[PDB]
C-alpha cells in the first residue's frame, strides 16, 4: 500500500510544467498525422493553462539561441520535462575547432542555477536585455553551427565586433535575473596559442564585481565557457579589458518569492540511436530537486522519439494530486507506507508499525 | 501524544555542538565558584567528545579576531549555540567614525554562509592562510576597538600598510595565497566603505580575489552610497582549493588570514541553531536568525528573557530546556520542533528531517 510512485505530480492545483514537443499541444497543427500520440502528457491537460512547451525547444536553447520560445509560467510546484533539444546529438560548438563537451558543461551549469532558483520563486519568464555602448562597433554572430540540416545561432551573450570595451545594461522588473558570463577558452588549432579573453560584470550600485578570464589550461578545442550568475535589479557595466566585449541579451526573470518548494525534473532524452546526456541529472540535486526517469530506452510510438509508454507513465501523475513528494517518488496518501519518505515535501506518511 | 518539542537533538549519536561559555566544560577551571550552573548543557555531555566550545568566543569572533579559538568538529547533525560574544553590546567598529551596524551585516552574512555549508559537510575547522608578497610593506592592525574593558583586534583579513615614507611605486598591490587541505574554504572579501571624518569625501577601496587556475574573479569596490560611518564591509566567499591572487588595484591591499575549512561531504542534513543572546540588560541581535533559514537550518528560541542563575547571562532554565534534547535521540527534526516518535502526532512535521510521524486520522 502507498508505495512511492515513479511520477511527477502536485499537492494541489498550483503547479506548472515547462516542456518541449512531448508536452506541446499546439504542435499537432504542424504535423501531417494529426493526433496527440507524439505527446507524453495526457491531452486533457491541454486546456489546464499550466503548460509552457514548444516543439523543438528547451529552456537552455531559448536562453542562448535565436530559435527562441518565450517560456513563461507561474506556480508553487514547478516541473520540467525538457532538455533533449540541446544534446550531443545536436552537436553544437561555436567554431569548427570547438567542443561540444564545453556546451554540455554550460548546460549543466545553466540548469543547476535554474532548478535551484525555481525552488524559491513562483514565476519564470525570459526577458530581453538592452545595452548602451559609446562606439560604432555592432553585434556579430561569432558562435554558430550547422548540424542535422538545422543552423543554430547563439545570440546570448551578444558579441560586439571590433574599440570601446565596455557597455552598460540595466536589470529591472524581476527579483533576480539569470544571465550568462562567458569567455572563449582554448588554443587555436593551427597555431596552438591560447585565446585571450576577459569579461567582467560590475554592479555600479553595490560595487560587486563578477569576472571570468581565459586561462592556459589544457582543454584542447576553442569554445565558449559560460557561468550563470543570479543577479539583482540594478545598473551594471560589462567590461572586457580591451578584449572581446560580450553583454547579456536575455535573462531568466525570476519573480514572486515563495517558501522553499522543490522542483521536479523528468529525464529528457532521445531514443538511443541518438546521443543524449545526463546534464540535467547533474543539475537536479537534493533538497531542491527531484529527478524522475524510466528504466528503459525511449521507445516512441509516434516516431522513435515521441510517445513513450514509460515517460507517459511518469507524466501521468499530473492528472491527480498526491500527498507528498520525495526522493524515491510520490506518495499518493498521507497516512502509512512501507517505506520512509526521503527528503519529503508535503503531508507525508509514516512507515512505522501502527500498534 | 508526540507533540513537537522545543529542543535541539539528534537522530543518532553522530552529532556535534559548537558553543561558548554556556557549553564550555573547561571554563569551570577559571571560575571562583566551581560548579556547572553557568552551563545551559547537561554536564554529563562533557565527556561525549561532541563539543567544541570556548568561553568568551564565537565562530565569527575566532574567524575575524586575534582572540582565537580553533573551533573544530565533525558530525552528521550539526548544532550551534553561539554568537552572543559578538553583539551590539560588544560594540565593535574598525574606527572611531565606524559603525556597528556594518558589523551586524557582516555577522549575518558570515553565518548565512556557514549554516548553508554545514548542511553539506561533516567537518569544520579554522585554518590559517599565509601569503607571499614581493614588497617591503607589512601587516597593520587597521581595525580595532576598545569597549567593556576588552580590546578587540581584527586580524582577518590582513591589511598591508603602505609605507608613506617610501615612493608610491614601492607599494605592491597584490599578494598570492594558496587554499589547500579542504573541500571548500570560507574566506572574507572586504572593503572600507563610507565618508572620512569631517569630510564629504568617500573612502576609495578595491579588493579582488582571482583564481589563477580557473580564471574566476570575485571583486568588491567601495561606492559612494550614503551609509553612516566609515567601516569594513565584508562578503563571505566559499572558495575551492587552488592558487589565488589578492589584488587591490593600487589601493589598500587585504588578504585572508583565516578560513573555515569545510571537509567530508554528506547528503543534505539541516543544521540546528539556538538563539544566542544576553540577558536583556545587554543589547543582543537577531543576525543568526536572519542566517538560519529553511530548508538548511532550524532555529530554536525560548519565549522569555535570558535569566541566568549563575549570573544574569549564564544558566537559563528555558535555554537549558532547549539544550536538554542533546541527551536523547529523536525520530524527526522539523521547523516547529523535534518529534520524539516516528509514528503519529497531532501536527504535521514541517520541512522534516528523519523518520517522521503522520498526523492523518488512522482508520
Ligand atoms: C530581525 O530583527 C529585525 C529588527 O527588529 C526585524 O526587522 C523588523 O521586522 C519588523 C517586523 O516585521 C518590521 O516591522 C514593520 O515595520 C514597518 C515599517 O517599516 C519601516 O519603518 C521602520 C521605522 O523606521 C523609522 O525609524 C528609523 C529610526 O530608527 C529611521 O531609520 C527610519 O528612517 C524611520 O524614521 C522615519 O519614520 C519615523 C516614523 O516611522 C519618523 O518618526 C522619523 O522621523 C522618520 O521620518 C524602518 O526600520 C523600516 O526599515 C526597514 O525596511 C526598509 C525598506 O523596506 C529597509 O531599507 C530598512 O533597512 C529596514 O529593513 C521601514 O522603513 C511597519 O509598517 C510594519 O507595520 C505592520 O505591522 C505592524 C506590526 O507591528 C502593525 O502595527 C501595522 O499595523 C502594520 O500591519 C511593521 O511594524 C520592521 O520594519 C523591521 N525592522 C528593521 C530594522 O528591519 C527582522 O524581521 C528580524 N528577522 C528575523 C529573522 O527575526
Ligand atoms: C527569542 O525570543 C525572545 C523572547 O521572546 C525574543 O525577545 C524579544 O525581543 C523582541 C524584539 O527585539 C522584543 O519585542 C519588543 O517589545 C518591546 C516592549 O516589550 C517590553 O516588555 C518585555 C516583556 O514583554 C520586556 O522584556 C522588555 O524589556 C520590554 O520593555 C517593544 O517596544 C518593541 O517594539 C519595537 O519593535 C516593533 C516590531 O517591529 C516595532 O513595531 C516598534 O515600533 C518598536 O521598534 C518590540 O516589539 C521583546 O521585548 C523581547 N521579549 C523578551 C521576553 O525579552 C527574541 O527577539 C527572540 N529572538 C529572535 C532572534 O527572534
Ligand atoms: C487537486 O486539487 C485541486 C485543489 O487543490 C483541484 O483544483 C481545482 O481544479 C479546478 C478545475 O476546473 C479549478 O477550477 C479549481 O479552482 C481548483 N480548486 C481549488 C480549490 O483550487 C484539482 O481539481 C484536484 N485534482 C483532481 C484530479 O481532483
Ligand atoms: C555607463 O554608465 C557610466 C556610469 O554611470 C557612465 O559614466 C558616467 O557618464 C557621465 C556622462 O558621460 C559622466 O558625467 C560621469 O563622469 C560618468 N561616471 C563614471 C562613474 O564614470 C557612462 O557614460 C555610461 N556609458 C554608456 C556607454 O552609456
Ligand atoms: C583579466 O584579463 C584582463 C585582460 O587580459 C587583464 O587586464 C590586462 O592585464 C594585462 C597583464 O597584466 C595588462 O598588460 C593589460 O594592461 C591589462 N589590461 C587592462 C585593461 O587592465 C586582467 O588583469 C585580468 N584580471 C586578472 C585579475 O588577472
Ligand atoms: C535514465 O534511465 C536510463 C535507462 O535505464 C539510463 O540509461 C542507461 O544507463 C545505463 C547506466 O549508464 C547504461 O548502461 C544503459 O545502457 C542505459 N540504458 C538505456 C536503455 O539507454 C539513463 O542513463 C538514465 N538517465 C540518467 C540521467 O541517469
Ligand atoms: C585547527 O585545527 C585543524 C584540525 O585539527 C588544523 O588543521 C591541521 O593543520 C595542519 C598544519 O596546518 C595540517 O597539515 C593538517 O592537514 C590539518 N589537519 C586536518 C585534519 O585538516 C589547523 O591548522 C588548526 N588551526 C590552527 C590555526 O592552529
Ligand atoms: C596561526 O596564526 C597564529 C597567530 O596568527 C600563530 O600563533 C603565533 O605563533 C608565533 C610563533 O609561531 C608566536 O610567537 C605567537 O605568540 C603566536 N601568536 C598568537 C596570537 O598565538 C599560530 O602559530 C598559527 N598556527 C599555525 C598552525 O600556523
Ligand atoms: C575598482 O576599483 C579600482 C581602483 O579604483 C579600479 O581600477 C582603476 O580604475 C580607474 C577608474 O576607472 C582607472 O583610472 C585605473 O586605471 C584603474 N586602476 C588600476 C590600477 O587598475 C577598477 O576599475 C574598479 N573596478 C571596476 C570594475 O570598476
Ligand atoms: C490511508 O488512507 C487511505 C485513503 O483514504 C485509506 O483507504 C481507505 O480505507 C477505507 C477503509 O477500508 C476504504 O473503505 C476506502 O475505500 C479506502 N480508500 C482507498 C483509496 O484505498 C486507508 O485505510 C488509510 N490507511 C490507514 C491505515 O488509515
Ligand atoms: C515573455 O513574456 C513575458 C510575459 O508576457 C514578458 O513580460 C516578456 O517581455 C516576454 N519576453 C520577451 C523576450 O519578449
Ligand atoms: C553523468 O554521467 C557520468 C559518466 O558518463 C557519471 O560519471 C556521472 O555520475 C553522471 N551523473 C549523474 C548525476 O547521473
Ligand atoms: C507510537 O509509538 C509508541 C512508542 O514506540 C507507542 O507506545 C505508541 O502506541 C505508538 N502509537 C501508535 C498509534 O502506533
Ligand atoms: C604569484 O603567482 C604568479 C604566478 O601566477 C608568479 O609569477 C608570482 O611570482 C607570484 N607572486 C608571489 C609573491 O608569489
Ligand atoms: C541514540 O542512538 C544511538 C544509536 O542510534 C545510541 O547508541 C545512543 O545511546 C542513543 N542515545 C540514547 C540516549 O538512547
Ligand atoms: Na569578453
Ligand atoms: Na582593498
- A325 within some domain: no
Tell me if chain A has a CB within 8 Å of the CB of B224.
no
Q: Which of A140, A138, A141 is nearest to A164 (CA)?
A: A138
Cα distance between residue B226 and residue B7, in whole Å: 42
Query: Which residue segment(s) compose the domain that B85 sits in?
Result: 14-328
Kindly tell me the number of DSSP H helices and DSSP E strands found in chain A: 4, 23
- Any B CB within 8 A of A348 CB: yes
Collapsing DSSP to helix, strand or coil, A260 comes out as coil
**B352: which strand partners?**
none
Cβ of residue B211 lying under 6 Å from some atom of ligand 14: no
CA distances, A283 to each of A211, A290, B101, B165 (Å) = 22, 10, 37, 54
Given ligand 8 and candidates B128, B131, B259, which is best to mutate, with the most ligand atoms within 8 Å of its CB? B128
- Measured in whole angstroms, how far is the alpha carbon of residue A168 from the centre of its chain? 26
Does B181 contact chain A (CB < 8 Å)? no
Contact at CB, B217 and A206, closer than 8 angstroms: no
A80-97 in b/e form (b: 16+ CB < 10 A) is bbbbbbbbbbbebbbbee
Q: Atom of ligand 2 at shortest distance to CA of B288?
A: 60
Spatial neighbors of A267 by CB under 8 A, at least 6 apart, are A278, A280, A281, A291, A292, A293, A294
- Cα angle: B92, vertex B96, B101; to 5 degrees: 40
Residue in chain A lying closest to B208 (CA):
A209
Whether A83 is in a domain gets the answer yes
CB within 8 A of B14, min separation 6: which ones? B75, B76, B77
**Residues whose CB falls within 8 Å of the CB of residue B258, separated by 6 or more in sequence, listed in order:** B62, B63, B64, B68, B126, B127, B128, B129, B155, B156, B187
- Which residues neighbour A221 within 8 Å (Cβ) at sequence distance 6 or greater? A93, A97, A98, A99, A101, A102, A186
Cell reading at B166: 617610501
Q: How far is ligand 5, taken at its centre, from the CA of residue A241, in Å? A: 7
Pick from B294, B355, B362: CB nearest A335: B362
Q: Which residues are registered as beta bridge partners of A160? A: A139, A245
* Residue B66 within any structural domain of the chain: yes
Q: Kindly give the pairing relationship between strand B297-300 and strand B271-274.
A: parallel
Extract the C-alpha cell encoding B194. 563610507
> Which residues form ligand 11's pocket by a CB distance below 6 Å?
A 70, 72, 125-128
Specify if B336 maps to a domain: no
Is there an atom of ligand 13 within 6 Å of B2 CB? no
Q: What is the C-alpha separation between B5 and B329, in angstroms, rounded?
A: 12
Calculate ∠ Cα B237-B243-B244, nearest 5°: 50
A167 contacts A131 by C-beta, under 8 angstroms: yes
Q: Which of B21, B222, B246, B284 is catalytic?
A: B21
How many Å is the Cα radius of gyration of chain B? 22
Residues 6+ apart with CB under 8 A from A192: none
Omega within 30 of 0 (cis) for the link into B157: yes
Output the CA torsion B231→B235→B240→B245 (10° steps). Answer: -40
Residue B146: count of CB within 10 angstroms of its CB: 11
- In the structure, which protein residues have their CB atom closer than 6 angstroms to any atom of ligand 7? B 70, 72, 125-128, 181
Cβ of A208 and B214 within 8 Å? no
Show the DSSP H helices in chain B as ranges.
59-64, 100-117, 287-291, 317-323
User: Taking a C-beta distance cutoff of 8 angstroms, is the pair B108, B58 a contact?
Assistant: no
CA distance linking residue A141 with residue A152, whole number of Å: 11
C-alpha cell recorded at residue A114:
535554474
Q: Report the distance separating Cα B214 and Cα A185, nearest Å.
A: 11
Tell me whether strands A223-231 and A176-185 are parallel, antiparallel or unpaired: antiparallel
Tell me if chain B has a CB within 8 Å of the CB of A218. Answer: no
Nearest to B21 by CA among B37, B32, B44, B9: B37
Is B204 annotated as catalytic? no
How far apart, in whole angstroms, are the C-alpha atoms of residue B279 and residue B272? Answer: 22
Q: What is the rounded distance in angstroms from the CA atom of residue A77 to the CA atom of residue A73?
A: 11
Q: For chain B, report the end-to-end CA distance as a whole number of angstroms.
A: 17
Question: A15-19 and A73-74: which strand pairing?
Answer: unpaired
Identify whether A1 is part of a domain: no
Q: B135: CA distance to ligand 9 center in Å?
A: 21
Length of chain A in terms of residues written: 355
- Number of domains composing chain B: 1
Of B353, B312, B325, B338, whose CA–CA distance to B84 is shortest?
B312
What is the Cα–Cα distance from B134 to A150, expressed in whole angstroms?
A: 55
Q: Which position among B141, B228, B280, B311 bears the catalytic label?
A: B311
Which strands, in side-by-side order, build the sheet including A139-140? A139-140, A158-160, A245-247
SS3 B286: coil
Residue with cell 587552488: B242
CA B183, CA B122: separation in Å to the nearest integer?
11
Distance separating alpha carbons of residues A165 and A163, to the nearest angstrom: 6
Q: List gaps in chain A by the residue before each (C–N > 2.5 Å).
A: 162
Please indicate whether residue B125, judged by its CB atom, sits closer than 6 Å to ligand 8. no
Does the residue A237 lie in any domain?
Answer: yes
Neighbours of A75 (CB within 10 A): 21
Place of cell 507528498: A324
Nearest CA in chain B to A215: B215
The answer as to whether B335 is a domain residue is no
Backbone angles phi, psi at A32, to 5 degrees: -65, -40
Ligand 15 site, residue B329, Cβ cutoff 6 A: yes
Residue closest via CA to ligand 11's atom 6 equals A127
**Cα(A144)–Cα(B118) distance, integer angstroms:** 43
CA of B358 to the centre of ligand 3 (A): 24
The catalytic residue among A10, A20, A21, A277 is A21
Contact B342 A350 (CB under 8 A): yes
Q: How far apart are CA B19 and CA B56, in angstroms?
A: 10
Cell 568568551, residue located: B56
CB A231 within 8 A of CB A179: yes
- Which residue bears the cell 540541446? A86
Q: Which chain B residue has its CA at the smallest distance from A204's CA?
A: B223
A306 is catalytic: yes
A-chain residues within 8 Å CB-CB of B345? none
Are B55 and B24 in contact, with CB atoms under 8 Å apart? yes
Residue in B81, B113, B91 with CA at minimum distance from that of residue B259: B113
Query: Please, which residues have CB within 8 angstroms of residue B39's CB and are 6 or more apart in sequence?
Result: B21, B22, B23, B24, B25, B314, B315
Per the CB < 8 Å rule, is B355 touching A354?
no
**What Cα–Cα distance (Å) separates residue B55 from each residue in A68, B19, B144?**
60, 8, 21
Cis peptide bond upstream of A59, omega within 30: no
Structural domain includes residue B359: no
Q: CB of A191 within 8 A of CB of A221?
A: no
Q: What 3-state DSSP class applies to A228? A: strand
What are the phi and psi torsion angles at A232 (to 5°)?
Answer: -100, 160
**Angle CA A94–A99–A102, to nearest 5:** 95
CA angle B219, B225, B229 (to 5 degrees): 100
Q: With contact defined as beta carbons under 8 Å apart, do B94 and B145 qualify?
A: yes
Distance CA B136, CA B326 (A): 52
Q: Does any CB of chain B come closer than 8 Å to the CB of residue A214?
A: yes
Nearest to A211 among B219, B235, B352 (CB): B219
Q: Which three cell numbers stand for residue B37?
A: 550552573
Instruction: For residue A340, give the chain B residue with the closest CA.
Output: B355
What is the C-alpha radius of gyration for chain A, rounded to an integer number of angstroms?
A: 22
Instruction: Identify the helix (H) or strand (E) that includes residue A106.
Output: helix A100-117
Q: Do B210 and B247 form a contact (C-beta atoms < 8 A)?
A: yes
At A111, phi and psi to the nearest 5? Answer: -70, -30
Resolution in A: 2.0
Alpha-carbon torsion (A11, A17, A23, A26), positive or negative:
positive
Asked if A209 and B216 come within 8 Å (Cβ–Cβ), the reply is no
Ligand 7 centroid to residue B125 C-alpha, Å = 8
Coil, helix or strand for A340?
coil
Does B214 contact chain A (CB < 8 Å)?
yes
Q: Of A209, A227, A352, which is closest to B220 when you measure between CB atoms? A: A209
- Residue found by looking up cell 569544520 in the block: B124
H/E element holding B123? strand B121-128
Question: How far is residue A68 from each of residues A59, B5, B243, measured CA to CA in Å?
Answer: 9, 52, 40
How far is A31 from chain B, CA to nearest CA, in Å?
Answer: 45
Coil, helix or strand for A113? Answer: helix
Distance CA A59, CA A126 (A): 9
d(CA B271, CA B296) in angstroms, rounded, equals 6
- Cα A70 to chain centroid distance, Å, stands at 13
Contact B294, B100 (CB under 8 A): no
Ligand nearest to the CA of A160: 16
Dist. CA A210–CA A201, nearest whole Å: 5
Closest residue to A287, CB basis, from B217, B218, B295: B295
A228 alpha carbon – ligand 5 mean position (Å): 22
Beta-carbon contacts of B16 under 8 Å, excluding residues fewer than 6 positions away, are B50, B51, B52, B73, B74, B75, B77, B78, B79
User: What is the spatial order of strands in the sheet that B15-19 belongs to?
Assistant: B51-53, B15-19, B77-81, B271-274, B297-300
CA distances from A145 to A140, A154, A160, B285 (A): 14, 9, 19, 56
Q: In angstroms, what CA-CA distances link A122 with A38, A81, B284?
A: 29, 17, 35
Q: How many CB atoms lie within 10 A of CB B91?
A: 16
A211 touches chain B (CB under 8 A): yes
Q: Do B218 and A207 touch (CB under 8 A)?
A: no
* Residue B217 CB–ligand 5 contact under 6 Å: yes
| Atom number of ligand 4 nearest to Cα A134 | 27
Query: Could you tell me how many CB contacts below 8 A there are between chain A and chain B?
Result: 95
Question: Cα–Cα distance between B133 and B138 in angstroms, integer?
Answer: 9
Q: Which residues of B touch A332 (CB under 8 A)?
A: none
Cβ(B75)–Cβ(B271) below 8 Å: no
Sheet harboring B332-334: ordered strands across? B337-339, B332-334, B353-354
The answer to whether the bond into B295 is cis (omega within 30° of 0) is yes
> Cell numbers at residue B109, please?
552574512
Q: Distance between CA atoms of B118 and B109, rounded to whole angstroms?
A: 14
CA-based nearest residue to B59, from B51, B71, B67: B71
CA–CA dist A72, A51 (Å, integer): 9
Amino acid at each position: 500500500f502507498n508505495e512511492p510512485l515513479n511520477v511527477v505530480s502536485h499537492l494541489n492545483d498550483d503547479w506548472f510544467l515547462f516542456g518541449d514537443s512531448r508536452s506541446d499541444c499546439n504542435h499537432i497543427n504542424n504535423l501531417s498525422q494529426q493526433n496527440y500520440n507524439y505527446m507524453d502528457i495526457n491531452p486533457e491537460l491541454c486546456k489546464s493553462g499550466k503548460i509552457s512547451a514548444k516543439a523543438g525547444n528547451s529552456l537552455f536553447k531559448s536562453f542562448h539561441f535565436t530559435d527562441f520560445y518565450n517560456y513563461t509560467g507561474e506556480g508553487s510546484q514547478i516541473i520540467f520535462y525538457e532538455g533533449v533539444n540541446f544534446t550531443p546529438y545536436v552537436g553544437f560548438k561555436c567554431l569548427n575547432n570547438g567542443d561540444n563537451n564545453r556546451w554540455m558543461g554550460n548546460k549543466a551549469r545553466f540548469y543547476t542555477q535554474l532548478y535551484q532558483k525555481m525552488a524559491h520563486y513562483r514565476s519564470l519568464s525570459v526577458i530581453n536585455i538592452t545595452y548602451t555602448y559609446n562606439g560604432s562597433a555592432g553585434p556579430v554572430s561569432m558562435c554558430k553551427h550547422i548540424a542535422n540540416g538545422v543552423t543554430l545561432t547563439l545570440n546570448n551573450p551578444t558579441f560586439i565586433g571590433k574599440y570601446e570595451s565596455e557597455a552598460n545594461f540595466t536589470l529591472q522588473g524581476c527579483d533576480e535575473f539569470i544571465v550568462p558570463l562567458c569567455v572563449f577558452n582554448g588554443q587555436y588549432l593551427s597555431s596552438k596559442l591560447y585565446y585571450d579573453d576577459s569579461q567582467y560584470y560590475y554592479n555600479v550600485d553595490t560595487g560587486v564585481l563578477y569576472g571570468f578570464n581565459s586561462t592556459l589550461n589544457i582543454t584542447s578545442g576553442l569554445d565558449l565557457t559560460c557561468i550563470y550568475l543570479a543577479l539583482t535589479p540594478g545598473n551594471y557595466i560589462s567590461i572586457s579589458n580591451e578584449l572581446l566585449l560580450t553583454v547579456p541579451s536575455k535573462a531568466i526573470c525570476l519573480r514572486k518569492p515563495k517558501a522553499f518548494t522543490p522542483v521536479q525534473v523528468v529525464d529528457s532524452r532521445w531514443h538511443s540511436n541518438r546521443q543524449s546526456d545526463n546534464m540535467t541529472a547533474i543539475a537536479c540535486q537534493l533538497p531542491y530537486c527531484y529527478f524522475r526517469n524510466t528504466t528503459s530506452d525511449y521507445n516512441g510510438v509516434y516516431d522513435s522519439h515521441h510517445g513513450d509508454a514509460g515517460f507517459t507513465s511518469i507524466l501521468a501523475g499530473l492528472m491527480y494530486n498526491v500527498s507528498c513528494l520525495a526522493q524515491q517518488g510520490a506518495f499518493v496518501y498521507n497516512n502509512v507506507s512501507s517505506s520512509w519518505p526521503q527528503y519529503p515535501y508535503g503531508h507525508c506518511p509514516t512507515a512505522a508499525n501502527i500498534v
